[PDB]
Amino acid sequence: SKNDIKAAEMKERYLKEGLYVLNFMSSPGSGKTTMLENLADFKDFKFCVVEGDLQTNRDADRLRKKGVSAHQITTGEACHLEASMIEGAFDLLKDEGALEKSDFLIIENVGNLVCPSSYNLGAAMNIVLLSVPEGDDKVLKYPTMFMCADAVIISKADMVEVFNFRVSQVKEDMQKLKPEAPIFLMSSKDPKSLEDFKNFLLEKKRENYQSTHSF
Ligand SMILES: Nc1nc2c(ncn2[C@@H]2O[C@H](COP(=O)(O)OP(=O)(O)O)[C@@H](O)[C@H]2O)c(=O)[nH]1
Ligand SMILES: [Mg+2]
Numbered sequence: 001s002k003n004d005i006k007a008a009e010m011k012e013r014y015l016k017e018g019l020y021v022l023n024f025m026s027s028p029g030s031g032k033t034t035m036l037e038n039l040a041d042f043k044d045f046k047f048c049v050v051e052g053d054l055q056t057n058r059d060a061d062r063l064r065k066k067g068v069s070a071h072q073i074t075t076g077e078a079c080h081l082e083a084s085m086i087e088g089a090f091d092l093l094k095d096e097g098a099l100e101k102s103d104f105l106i107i108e109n110v111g112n113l114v115c116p117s118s119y120n121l122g123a124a125m126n127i128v129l130l131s132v133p134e135g136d137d138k139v140l141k142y143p144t145m146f147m148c149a150d151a152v153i154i155s156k157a158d159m160v161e162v163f164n165f166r167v168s169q170v171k172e173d174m175q176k177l178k179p180e181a182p183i184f185l186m187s188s189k190d191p192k193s194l195e196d197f198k199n200f201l202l203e204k205k206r207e208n209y210q211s212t213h214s215f
């Protein structure tokens, strides 16, 4: 419970700051940073970002180039984020005034479809991206990751035809694993899909949905 304890303590601070916290998990390159870049275009969607990578400030810089307050966590070798890692980034974002102006604090986890599924970060929602080029068979291959999802995003949905990707396969696999979890088709080329997902998040904050998932 060491991480579990720390996650619970971070959740105290999230609520204190009036933040709805999202934890995005996927394979490397599923489209997380691009999605956040596109979400920044919705003025009614106010958020700051904690970025998890092994090295470089490449994702954080892309986001800051778009006007999003973002801070990079460099894990060095760790394949995942842990609750204790969030604290440092949280404190900086607080001191910078980023938290005061945000309705959402968004955690972009280390690219990894396995290990981040085992670490509670105190998030209200844990959302998993599965990109079309990865294959429509991945849900059952990484069941523990997809079972922690409060929502699944099929990203790069513009690529469905060229990859002969079967949305039905993902739907049916998720039906077995976690039927309550909604599935979203998303493309960076489809503003309407971004808008739909944004409104979904807004409503979730409204309800104050808080995942009870055990990691
Ligand atoms: N075709 C297509 N490409 C995308 C989409 N979203 C992201 N990409 C591309 O996928 C690559 C990796 O995206 P990135 O945002 O870095 O994903 P991340 O590593 O998970 O943060 C980049 O070349 C993006 O241009 C999409 O919806 N459709
Ligand atoms: Mg990224």
Ligand code: NI
Pocket (backbone or CB within 6 Å): 079, 114, 115
């Ligand atoms: Ni690992």
